[PDB]
Design an enzyme around this catalytic site. Structure first.
Site, PDB file in Angstrom:
ATOM      1  N   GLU A 122       0.746  -1.273  -0.068  1.00 11.54           N
ATOM      2  CA  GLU A 122      -0.122   0.109   0.105  1.00 11.54           C
ATOM      3  C   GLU A 122       1.127   1.333   0.094  1.00 11.54           C
ATOM      4  O   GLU A 122       0.826   2.099  -0.038  1.00 11.54           O
ATOM      5  CB  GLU A 122      -0.628   0.233   1.132  1.00 11.54           C
ATOM      6  N   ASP A 133       0.665   3.876  -2.418  1.00 10.24           N
ATOM      7  CA  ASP A 133       0.366   4.820  -2.331  1.00 10.24           C
ATOM      8  C   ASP A 133       0.279   6.369  -3.586  1.00 10.24           C
ATOM      9  O   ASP A 133      -0.404   6.396  -4.235  1.00 10.24           O
ATOM     10  CB  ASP A 133       0.561   5.461  -1.361  1.00 10.24           C
ATOM     11  N   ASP A 158      -6.932   1.242   0.330  1.00  7.22           N
ATOM     12  CA  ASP A 158      -6.031   1.214   1.196  1.00  7.22           C
ATOM     13  C   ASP A 158      -4.920  -1.180   0.041  1.00  7.22           C
ATOM     14  O   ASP A 158      -3.800  -0.304  -0.298  1.00  7.22           O
ATOM     15  CB  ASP A 158      -5.616   0.945   2.332  1.00  7.22           C
ATOM     16  N   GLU A 180      -4.647   0.472  -3.294  1.00  5.63           N
ATOM     17  CA  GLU A 180      -3.652   1.216  -3.039  1.00  5.63           C
ATOM     18  C   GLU A 180      -2.522   0.363  -3.010  1.00  5.63           C
ATOM     19  O   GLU A 180      -1.658   0.180  -3.893  1.00  5.63           O
ATOM     20  CB  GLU A 180      -3.418   2.063  -2.291  1.00  5.63           C
TER      21      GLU A 180
HETATM   22 MG   LIG Z   1      -3.568   4.894   1.746  1.00  2.00          MG
END
Ligand SMILES: [Mg+2]
Ligand SMILES: [Mg+2]
Lengths: 149, 148
Positions: free
Chosen positions: A41, A45, A108, A111
């Protein structure tokens, strides 16, 4: 009848070389402490952050940072990331303990999922970039015309 | 090209197909309200953040995000960006009118340069990332291991 532990590669349009790379991205701490999507993640990001502003710069009617920043914040919020994941039925493949998953894990995982693909692909930014666009390019632009946030 | 550009390129290790593309990344709005680095800087910010985190993810001996974030905070500092910009004496090529160059402006141009490299190469993230590693991967690595 079939498709429970996977079918998400059929949504993505990408078949992993290393399955435990896709797994890991979909695995939250509570379910697995050895390998969960935390490190993926972190990569995802910034990886996804680039996919979006690269589009922003190109299709936004403006060009000035002042009109791009509030629009940028929206297109990289968990909320919007949820609407992108819903199209993946992401919640369906997440491997999480107990009954509390939430909207934070999701984006997430959203991500960690494109970072896993990235890494799976042999670090192929362009391809992965393009794989990302075939799925949500449509939706991002739309979000660019209406001007949200 | 021109009587200057050509040298930024040899240091950079990349020659542009679009000459005005590299200029716009070096150009402060004070010099050209019409074509200045501001939008490239937007791109290169996300762009540069990506290259560096990628290296971070890869070579950090500790993967816990609680370990990652800090070094990252430095790796994207305008302080560290200036460290890297020094490698191509970037202040030397920046276009600016009424007023002086700053570290901040130098950091903003650093970003803008890489977004222009990325765009001029055909929006080729892989090539651009490697050019970025050829030049700076070594300093980022010595850095990661708490290299002052
Ligand atoms: Mg995040
Ligand atoms: Mg900046």
């Amino acid at each position: 009848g079939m498709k429970m532990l996977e079918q998400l590669e059929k949504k993505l349009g990408y078949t992993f070389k290393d399955k435990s790379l896709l797994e890991k991205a979909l695995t939250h701490v509570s379910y697995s402490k050895k390998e969960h999507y935390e490190t993926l993640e972190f990569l995802g990001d910034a990886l996804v952050n680039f996919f979006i502003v690269d589009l922003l710069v190109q299709y936004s009617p403006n060009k000035r940072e002042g009109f791009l920043s509030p629009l940028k914040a929206y297109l990289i919020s968990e909320e919007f990331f949820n609407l992108l994941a819903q199209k993946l039925e992401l919640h369906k493949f997440i491997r999480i303990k107990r009954g509390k998953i939430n909207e934070t894990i999701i984006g997430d995982v959203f991500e960690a999922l494109w970072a896993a693909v990235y890494i799976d692909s042999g670090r192929d930014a362009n391809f992965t970039r393009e794989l990302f666009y075939k799925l949500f390019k449509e939706d991002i632009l739309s979000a660019i015309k209406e001007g949200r946030h």
